[PDB]
Amino acid sequence: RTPSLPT
Amino acid sequence: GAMGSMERASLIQKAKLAEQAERYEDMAAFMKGAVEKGEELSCEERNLLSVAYKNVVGGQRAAWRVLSSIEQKSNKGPEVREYREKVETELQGVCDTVLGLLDSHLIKEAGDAESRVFYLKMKGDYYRYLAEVATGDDKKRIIDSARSAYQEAMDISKKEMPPTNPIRLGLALNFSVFHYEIANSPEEAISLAKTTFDEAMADLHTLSEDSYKDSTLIMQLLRDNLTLWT
Ligand SMILES: *Cc1ccc(-n2c(-c3cccnc3)nc3ccccc32)cc1Br
């Protein structure tokens, strides 16, 4: 899965 | 709810403490309590809400993926499926709680672009998480709900925010992920990431050093995805 915005 | 007797300011203070203690379930419960006080949230408060639930659901999603992978390799008794279902239901419940807070009544009271875009982005993200685990009759509607929320957020951000605004950038990053991972639209994903990157690059000259650091961080995440997808 591709990375979304991290925290 | 259970936080009904605690002062709003105490809930926010305790959310910050829970963040420091890496107690994200507590953090989320404190922020839910704060939202349920009925007042609008500040920028800092919106970010506390986001951090808390992203950490909670992030753990759940990671567990679901581990279990789903095992289940698929098994296809043995019903246990793997049962436990995957248990984690799935708990994840769905967290998503439903967040969606509930946005609908009752964060989005309807959010008039400024920064707040309204932030909440619609969150709405897109949590429908996206629901989509990741959906299989039944409502899967297409779930995907469309994510899409609709992200699209409204994008339309406002394009009208009201500069191309370097971190919220605008993070929204584009996550909508591009939606297209690639959920909507089976890799070309749309790539286009959105590249147009967002390029328009931001051209506006960096307007920024302070601190703003520049924020914007370029998110731009690098866009670039990282483009590198992975091409
Ligand atoms: C979805 C999302 C996007 C952007 C950030 N965020 C912000 C920010 C600025 C103004 C208001 N809210 C958030 N600043 C950031 C710097 C670095 C990385 C991300 C940043 C947060 C979220 Br949840």
Size of chain B in residues: 230
Q: What is the DSSP code string of B151-166?
A: HHHHHHHHHHS-TT-H
**B95 and B129 in contact (C-beta within 8 Å)?**
yes
Protein residue with its CA nearest to atom 16 in ligand 1: B214
The CATH H-level superfamily of B8-229 is 14-3-3 domain (1.20.190.20)
- Chain B residues near residue A7 by CB distance under 8 angstroms: 50-51, 54-55, 58
Structure token digits, residue B2: 């259970």
The set of residues, in sequence order, having a beta carbon less than 8 Å from that of B93 and lying 6+ positions away, is none
**B193 and B176 in contact (C-beta within 8 Å)?**
yes
- CA-based radius of gyration for chain A: 6
Interval between CA B188 and ligand 1 midpoint (Å): 23
**B152 and B204 in contact (C-beta within 8 Å)?**
no
DSSP 8-state assignment for residue B204: G
Angle B28-B38-B19 (CA atoms, 0-180°, nearest 5)? 20
Judged by phi (left if over 0) then psi (alpha if -120 to 50, else beta), residue B74 lies in: alpha
**A2 and B181 in contact (C-beta within 8 Å)?**
yes
Experimental method: X-ray
Query: Can you tell me the distance from the alpha carbon of B174 to that of B122, in angstroms, rounded to the nearest whole number?
Result: 10
**B196 and B179 in contact (C-beta within 8 Å)?**
no
In order of B101, B165, B171, the CA distances from B109 in angstroms are 12, 22, 20
What B101-109 contacts at long range (C-beta under 8 Å, 24+ apart), as own/partner pairs, is B101/B32, B101/B35, B101/B36, B101/B49, B102/B126, B105/B38, B106/B35, B106/B40, B106/B41, B109/B40
Structure token digits, residue B204: 């960096």
* Amino acid, single-letter form, for residue B209: E
Which residues of B have a CB under 8 Å from any CB of A? 50-51, 54-55, 58, 65, 125, 170, 173-174, 177, 180-181, 218, 221, 224-225, 228-229
**B179 and B188 in contact (C-beta within 8 Å)?**
yes
Query: Can you tell me the distance from the alpha carbon of B64 to that of B79, in angstroms, rounded to the nearest whole number?
Result: 14
Locate the domains of chain B by residue range: 8-229
Interval between CA B81 and ligand 1 midpoint (Å): 37
In order of B13, B18, B35, B42, B197, the CA distances from B29 in angstroms are 13, 10, 10, 18, 36
Half-sphere exposure (CA, 13 Å, Cβ side) for B25?
A: 4
Query: Can you tell me the distance from the alpha carbon of B152 to that of B17, in angstroms, rounded to the nearest whole number?
Result: 34
Collapse the DSSP code of A5 into the 3-class scheme (helix H, G, I; strand E, B; otherwise coil) and give the result: coil
Query: Can you tell me the distance from the alpha carbon of B153 to that of B195, in angstroms, rounded to the nearest whole number?
Result: 17
Is A4's CB within 8 Å of B125's CB? yes
**B68 and B41 in contact (C-beta within 8 Å)?**
no
Residue (of A3, A6, A4, A7) closest to B19 by Cα position: A7
Helices (H), B102-165: 113-133, 139-160
Alpha-carbon distance B19 to nearest alpha carbon in chain A (angstroms): 12
CB-based burial label for A4 (10 Å; 0-12, 13-18, 19+): buried
Query: Can you tell me the distance from the alpha carbon of B215 to that of B197, in angstroms, rounded to the nearest whole number?
Result: 10
Largest Cα–Cα distance of chain A, in whole Å?
17
Q: What is the DSSP code string of B43-91?
A: HHHHHHHHHHHHHHHHHHHHHHHHHHHHHHHH---SHHHHHHHHHHHHH
The structure tokens 């709900």 sit at B145
Q: What is the rounded (10 degree) CA torsion for B56, B147, B85, B60?
A: -20
Minimum-distance ligand 1 atom for the alpha carbon of B170: 3
Is B221's CB within 8 Å of A2's CB? no
Query: Can you tell me the distance from the alpha carbon of B101 to that of B118, in angstroms, rounded to the nearest whole number?
Result: 13
